[PDB]
Structures are given as structure tokens and as C-alpha cells.
Design a protein around this ligand. Structure first.
Ligand SMILES: *CC(=O)N1CCN(Cc2ccc(Cl)s2)CC1
Ligand SMILES: *CC(=O)N1CCN(Cc2ccc(Cl)s2)CC1
Lengths: 304, 304
């Protein structure tokens, strides 16, 4: 019993982290096979980030300008290219610690673990979600860019995120491992505001299922609702509209607990309208939305 | 910017996790040098856990009864001994992945990372604190026992916890790596109730410092207090008494932010007396107490 915000074990990703510098101090790269992936803003100066022309800046860079260090060992850069907002640095040595991996572009509401690194060295690991506004709520200081987000399915690491960007509101933006930003964000120091941070309704319901499984049940009530009725309340409270797809995804948690998805919707509706009244659910005083239904099943069943 | 509940990178500990069985299904062990450490209740049957006599039960066990598996490779057990509530299984092979390590017994209020494992396989990593009642609030299902808690100082893993025990209230109990339980708990299926889960005041103040550093400042007020006045309010709300030692430990965060510890105490006092009024601090609706002052400095400074 007990339910915790849990990250994937980071070992497989720790084995992939390197340091990159290209004239203007350091950030992180991801070393898979004989390619090191890093944010293209590694090539920027303190004059460049306002209105950078990356193709023009890159022309001034040669393989020998990209200093790539794995622990205390230097890697030889034998090629470099820009793909969208990432650089791919070809090295002469395959990373011997390369795990089975995939690059996946996640949807908003999907969770992943971040391995926060500085200068190619891991500092810690935490769980995130891709927000509906395509930001993430991370912990990233100068030097953390190139830190990656991932899921693991048994032995295969799915990399979904690379850190690039802090908005003036202290939320985070980055790319998939093809270098495409999540949402409308750009690697330029400009006026970029996040949209509404809507709550991931399907994740809140998953977490209410987790609470019931782990003994927190005070918020179950005598009510039910419909998708359309629930969605009127979701709208008012900046919750994502609940779809039949979301209901279908919650089916296993419904089956295990014997609480119909629409009955749990009616619980969530009362919590939205009435608040917690100073009570907690799985040690939280607000409705947690960074556990997916898959996350709840995984943690509740002891998957490795 | 941003402040997250962050665990240590788990790679160094993943390298140490094995599976142990001794007649009655499986739990985890920790493989350091040529010794595998595991809970002594691995030797129990379904008749034993009510009133186990571990010395008597152990007499029936030989080296060949302890099945120790690192991935798909079996380890040869050449000796076994009981130290308090752990077994030490001597194997003929030093773990080649043994990191620099220490065994430390932590004080209540100290935080650590847990690598949750099942059958010697890591499932995930989360941050805990040793509670003032010497429980921890974990995520542990059957098979998770032998999972360990740790801190890392650069390259040295300090192991502080091994999981043994779930109380009927769904909180967790275990031992240091010398096999001594934290608090009054025993590895017996009996009436064991946790005492008052008091809030770790010094950690709450640390986290309020973290909030200020990361832009969350609405709870700063025009007031100050004294240790004795604050402690009257701590008492009423089941907070640990604040000591001059705690004030001294918060000195660096005080210095960096320019907010006197006793002024932050006055903020915490108003939050206790008035509540959040529906507001949040670093994405929490309650006062977070599982970040130490060391944790806040580490995360706010990007230590690796
Ligand atoms: C996330 C991170 O490390 N940073 C630091 C770099 N910064 C942009 C710049 C790149 C070259 C420079 Cl000189 S400044 C983004 C945030
Ligand atoms: C934490 C954990 O894995 N468990 C399962 C084992 N249980 C005690 C027992 C040991 C031998 C048995 Cl048979 S049952 C404690 C919780």
C-alpha cells in the first residue's frame, strides 16, 4: 500500500548523459549509439538568444568546436548536423551503455521521468507531465538544458523530451528527440506566454482510483453524472473535457475497484464544487493530475 | 527555476539489487562486495509472521536454501548470518558494480530516495523522509521488502533504510543496513500503531525558502516571532519544536534570500493559523515537510 509520485529508475539514462560545450559554456547531451543529441542553442553567445539565426551561427562551427565529454573521457566528433532545434553530433565511438531505445512524441497529459543533469552529471530524477498548454513544470537551472525525459517499457527507454526553455513565468519548454518543440515554443529569448494550464481530468480520475485502492475513500458519494453534465463542471474549473476514450482507458481501474467511471466523475464533481474542506487524498490537499491511468495500474500492481 | 520533489539518480543502487528466496517466495537483497543484505523475514512461512523465533527458524536454513539471483545469473551462497533484523548472505563473487558506500542511521526529519524493487527488478524511485514517529510514507506492495533507501554524496552511496514492514494504517517501517528498526517497530505481525505524525518544522521552513527563491512569495508578511512564541503555535498544530540548531541550519537560506529565519517563522505561524485560503506554494495546497535545508540548497544550486 501507499501511493507515491514515482519516477523510472534512471540508471539506463545516466549511462547516456554527456557534457557538450561549443564556445559559450556547457549543457547536456544524450549519447545513443554514435550520436550525441543536444539543444542547438549550445552554439549561441549572449548576443544570439534574442534573435538567433541558427543556420548562420552553425556555419562558424566545425566538428572540433563541439567538446563532448563522457565522465573524464573526451569523445571525437566526426560529424554534426541540425535537425529542427537539436544538434546531432556524430562521434567515432558507439556508447557502450546504449540501452534499447525509441524516440516518441508524447501527447499532452502523458507523464514521464526527467533526469536533471548539469555538465553531463545527473543531479536527480522526478516525474513530470506534458501539460495541456505543452509546458512542463520542471526543476531546471542554467546548465540543465539537454536533460531528457523518458518512459521505460521493461528494457526499452522511450525518450520523449529534451529541455531547452524557461518561460518568464518559471515553467518549462522543450523538444522531442527529433528537435520539434512541444507546443508553439521557440528557442529564442522573446515574449512567449503559456496558455491556460488546464487540469488533466483523466489523470485526476486515475489518481482517485489510486486513493480508493490505498484506503482514502471519504470523497466517494451517493451520486452519478453523465459525460455532458460532468463536462459542464469541467469547463467551469478549467478541466480537460472527459471523452468516451478517457472512460474506456479508465475501464481496468473501474473493474478492479467496482466503482463506475461516471460515479467517480460525480465524486470529482463534488470535490470541484465543494473543495477538500481541509482534508487530504493520498497526502495531497489538491487534485493530483500527473498520474496517468497506466501509471496508477503500474504502481498499484508492482510492474518492473 | 521550478522546485520538484526529486530523488537521487538510482543507477548506482540498481547495480546492487538482487532477488532472494528461502522457501517462501521472494524479496529483494542488496549486493555490496561479496555480501547480500536482506530482511530476515525471508525465512518465514505463512505460520511464522504472527510470533516468529528467527534464531530457531534460521537453524533449518543452509547456504543452499538461499537462492540469490542477479538478473539471470545465480550467486553461490558460501555463508549466512543474522545481524539484528537483516540476513547477510556471503557470496563467492564481489558485485562488480559495487559503488563507494557507507551504512548510515538517519535521524527523524532526514530525507532519502527509495528504489522500489520487486523480485530484484527496479520499478521506480521516489523521495521519502524518516517521520518523527520513525515511520516512512512509501509505496510498497508484497515483494518490495529489501528495497533500500539511500542518499548520494557525489560518488558515495549512504544506505540508510531497508524496507521490512507495513502497519495496518498503510505506513511503512524498516531498518538501517545493520538490521536495527527505526523506532519501536518489530518484524512480527502484531498490534503496532504509529505515534503522532508530527510535521518536520525545519523542513517546512526550508521549503518556504525554496518557494521564495522560485517566485512564490504571497505568504511573506510584516511580522516576526520568537522561538518560544513560534513553539506555542508549533505545539498546537503537532509541529516539531524549533531549536536554535534548526535556526543555525537554515542560516545559508536566510543569507541567500535576506529573510531572517524568525520572520519566515512568523510567515509559517500565519499559514498555520489562517490556512492557504485556497492558494498554493510550489504547486502544493499543504505545507511540504520532506525537503531538508540541505535538499533545498542542493536543488536550488544544481549540485551533481
Ligand atoms: C537550460 C539551460 O541550461 N539554459 C542555459 C542556456 N540558455 C540559452 C543559452 C545558450 C547559449 C548561451 Cl551563451 S545562453 C537557456 C537556458
Ligand atoms: C514488503 C514485503 O515484500 N512483504 C512480503 C513479506 N511479508 C512478510 C513475509 C515473509 C515471509 C512470508 Cl511467507 S510473508 C512482509 C511484507
Amino acid at each position: 500500500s501507499g501511493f507515491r509520485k514515482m519516477a523510472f529508475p534512471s540508471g539506463k539514462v545516466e549511462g547516456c548523459m554527456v557534457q557538450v560545450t561549443c564556445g559559450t559554456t556547457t549543457l547536456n547531451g544524450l549519447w545513443l549509439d554514435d550520436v550525441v543529441y543536444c539543444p542547438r542553442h549550445v552554439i549561441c553567445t549572449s548576443e544570439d538568444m534574442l534573435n538567433p539565426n541558427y543556420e548562420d551561427l552553425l556555419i562558424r562551427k566545425s566538428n572540433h568546436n563541439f567538446l563532448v565529454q563522457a565522465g573524464n573521457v573526451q569523445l571525437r566528433v566526426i560529424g554534426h548536423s541540425m535537425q529542427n532545434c537539436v544538434l546531432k553530433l556524430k562521434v567515432d565511438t558507439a556508447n557502450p551503455k546504449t540501452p534499447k531505445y525509441k524516440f516518441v512524441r508524447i501527447q499532452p497529459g502523458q507523464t514521464f521521468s526527467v533526469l536533471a543533469c548539469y555538465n553531463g552529471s545527473p543531479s536527480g530524477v522526478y516525474q513530470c507531465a506534458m501539460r495541456p498548454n505543452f509546458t512542463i513544470k520542471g526543476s531546471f537551472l542554467n546548465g540543465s538544458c539537454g536533460s531528457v525525459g523518458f518512459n521505460i517499457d521493461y528494457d526499452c527507454v522511450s525518450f520523449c523530451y529534451m529541455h531547452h526553455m524557461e518561460l518568464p513565468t518559471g515553467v518549462h519548454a522543450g523538444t522531442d528527440l527529433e528537435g520539434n518543440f512541444y507546443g508553439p515554443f521557440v528557442d529564442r529569448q522573446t515574449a512567449q506566454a503559456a496558455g491556460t494550464d488546464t487540469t488533466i481530468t483523466v489523470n485526476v480520475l486515475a489518481w482517485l482510483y489510486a486513493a480508493v485502492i490505498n484506503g482514502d475513500r471519504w470523497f466517494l458519494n451517493r451520486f452519478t453524472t453523465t459525460l455532458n453534465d460532468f463536462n459542464l463542471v469541467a469547463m467551469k474549473y478549467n478541466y480537460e473535457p472527459l471523452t468516451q476514450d478517457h472512460v474506456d482507458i479508465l475501464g481496468p481501474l473501474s473493474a478492479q475497484t467496482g466503482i463506475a467511471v461516471l460515479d467517480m466523475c460525480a465524486s470529482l464533481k463534488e470535490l470541484l464544487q465543494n473543495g477538500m474542506n481541509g482534508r487530504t487524498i493520498l497526502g495531497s490537499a489538491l487534485l493530483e493530475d500527473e498520474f496517468t491511468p497506466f501509471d496508477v495500474v503500474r504502481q498499484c500492481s508492482g510492474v518492473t
